[PDB]
Design a binder for this molecule. Structure first.
Ligand SMILES: *[C@@H]1O[C@H](CO)[C@@H](O)[C@H](O)[C@H]1NC(C)=O
Lengths: 50, 50
């Protein structure tokens, strides 16, 4: 009696590798926050009047 | 009102016009002060009271 792995084996199937799409996490990103846009002005009427 | 016309003389004429208006007040956090529609600042919390 001999084991099943003692004889050479050939794959009769046509392998098809399937790599699922990895999960992705999106982080917040802004070129200019609303605070930066407000600060872009040279003068602010609110602060000047205050 | 202005003074009556008297030759080569300076005159002072006072005018007092009572005015009452309904203005929209605005305030921001910490709400320690508020502004008026006329652009005048009021350094008092809108909720101040006894
Ligand atoms: C992936 O597919 C290939 C054939 O494209 C196959 O040879 C391989 O054993 C498969 N599995 C792994 C883990 O690479």
């Amino acid at each position: 009696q001999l084991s099943r792995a003692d004889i050479t084996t050939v794959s009769t199937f046509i392998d098809l590798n399937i790599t699922m799409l990895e999960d992705h996490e999106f982080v917040p990103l802004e070129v200019y926050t609303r605070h930066e846009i407000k600060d872009s002005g040279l003068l602010d009427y609110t602060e000047v009047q205050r | 009102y202005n003074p009556s016309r008297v030759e080569a003389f300076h005159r002072y004429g006072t005018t007092v016009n009572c005015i009452v208006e309904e203005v929209d007040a605005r305030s921001v956090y910490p709400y320690d002060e508020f502004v008026l529609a006329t652009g005048d600042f009021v350094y008092m919390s809108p909720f101040y009271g006894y």
